[PDB]
Subunit: 190 residues, 3 copies
């Protein structure tokens, strides 16, 4: 297996010294740099850069600068995804985002782990844990979502949360560590 | 009522599709972009841009880039307000800041709420809860202040706090959620 | 004593009105601005700016933009230090970082304190508490390290942590406030 293949298979992989992955990260970082220095009202150019970054034709994906990602192509996006300022989709592990998702400012979606043992860590190895963000979700500002976490459809994550564990659907969850506080009634309003 | 008027009255309003509000946000975002790409030692130009953004003649309001706000004109500022890097004054609900206020880096003042029910949320409706920041206050870095919160004059908010509830005056408060730990003696020193 | 000397001696000092310190901060802010607007693939120029900022010849110190520091020369760096996006080394108090250190995105290392009493605070006085970051450490994203804190060699700090107290070596620690959860076995792997 190549190191990319290991990364995508939840295996330890050489994130720091694999040339292919280094080059892919460089591609993404240079696009993010361009995007981050493009006037917010230059709508067409921003759309072009977003679509180049994610290697997809986005449908109402609104990205407020600055933005960061590692690969770009490993973020799978639905439609109507609103990302406020200073977010980071750290996507060595796939980040899948549904439709109608509101992401507050200063949110970090982190799929990367390093070994706890410093000898193995210092060698550059990482293991990526995919993040799944359900459709119909809302994240307050200052949230961190950790590797391997799934947030269920219809759920709301309070500002400042550190999401260490999966959040069931149709739930309001807050805190460090983030815990369900109540269910959300999402039935069709009258 | 116009949607602006609803916003300013603590009513649900169409944040996402109201043209007037969309244009006002665009005004602010373009000024912030200019400010964020102005050399920190270009003192005059930075002052001009700050005053244009907040639609006021500021008196020793120090803004370290980058900075973000939604409207700008809905942040009411006293004198001697020091704002370190990467703050966001999300001001659909008025943010009132007193005199002699020290705001640490990476602080978010969030007045926006969305409906919990995804059907209403997906429609773009928001409700804004004003934030009041007393004079003579200090915020550590990495603080999030939530909608409708008042921090009393003379109070100190520890780094990393998530301020979910009002903080009384002359109090030290820390944590997620942020809780008063002790009173502060602010009497005139000898 | 000059105000710089007071700062470096853990004494109250006039951070806001001392011309020497004001000018030193301006030097650093202008370099950070240049660095933050330099293409990530302009390797040589970025290295030059980093080395100018820290007033040292760095050895594999990787700084992802944007970055911020107050003085630059008061950050003492080992080799193989990886700093992801949006970090701030607030270094009025010396920040000493060992070798083989992985620092996640949106981390703040804060050495500055202000007086709690607003009368003394409003005068501009600060007191700096040095931060020591051991070799062979890993910080998740969204961590804040507070004044005077030491993180021991071989330790790992979980994402979102607010590190209020010293962390012993060879420990995993998480939370707000950050607390040791277990020891880390760092013995030489087979
Ligand atoms: C959680 C949230 C969505 C709604 O809160 P709510 O349902 O109205 O609940 P309340 O505010 O009445 O508080 C419920 C309890 O949870 C706590 N709580 C609420 N939000 C919290 C949060 N983000 N973090 C930690 N605790 C929180 C409250 O302190 C309270 O504790 P108590 O039971 O001891 O009194 C809101 O607090 C929030 O985080 N909003 C996001 C704001 C934001 O980020 N806006 C910008 C992007 S649009
Ligand atoms: C709260 C603060 C202002 C002063 O702390 P303090 O009054 O000296 O109190 P101590 O450090 O002795 O700790 C008091 C207790 O509260 C806790 N605590 C202190 N600051 C805390 C914080 N920010 N978050 C969570 N807990 C905190 C400590 O862990 C300790 O718990 P214990 O009773 O179990 O021992 C300081 O911790 C802080 O947050 N400083 C801001 C630093 C900063 O952001 N600087 C950059 C901008 S200038
Ligand atoms: C702490 C960490 C390093 C490893 O966690 P771990 O050893 O696998 O432990 P677990 O995930 O099994 O959880 C252990 C417990 O601590 C809690 N916990 C774990 N990480 C936590 C964190 N960062 N903050 C708060 N609580 C945390 C869990 O909720 C769990 O609580 P429980 O005992 O009630 O079940 C990981 O959670 C983390 O923070 N990773 C960093 C991710 C990151 O920032 N990546 C980007 C930069 S590379
Ligand atoms: Cl938002
Ligand atoms: Cl500050
Ligand atoms: Cl990292």
């Amino acid at each position: 297996m190549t190191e990319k293949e290991k990364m995508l298979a939840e295996k330890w992989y050489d994130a720091n010294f694999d040339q292919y992955l280094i080059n892919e990260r460089a591609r993404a970082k240079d696009i993010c740099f361009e995007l981050n220095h493009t006037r917010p009202s230059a709508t067409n150019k921003r759309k072009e850069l977003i679509d180049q970054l994610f290697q997809t034709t986005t449908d109402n994906v609104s990205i407020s600068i600055p933005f960061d990602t590692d690969y770009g192509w490993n973020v799978k996006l639905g439609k109507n995804v609103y990302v406020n300022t200073n977010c980071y989709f750290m996507d060595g592990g796939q980040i899948t985002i549904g439709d109608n998702v509101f992401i507050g400012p200063n949110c970090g979606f982190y799929t990367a782990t390093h070994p706890l043992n410093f000898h193995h860590r210092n060698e550059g190895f990482e293991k990526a844990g995919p993040i799944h963000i359900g459709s119909n979700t809302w994240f307050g500002g200052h949230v961190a979502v950790l590797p391997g976490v799934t947030i269920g459809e219809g759920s709301v994550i309070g500002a400042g949360s550190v999401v260490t564990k999966d959040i069931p659907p149709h739930s309001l969850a807050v805190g460090n560590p983030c815990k369900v506080v109540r269910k959300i009634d999402n039935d069709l309003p009258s």
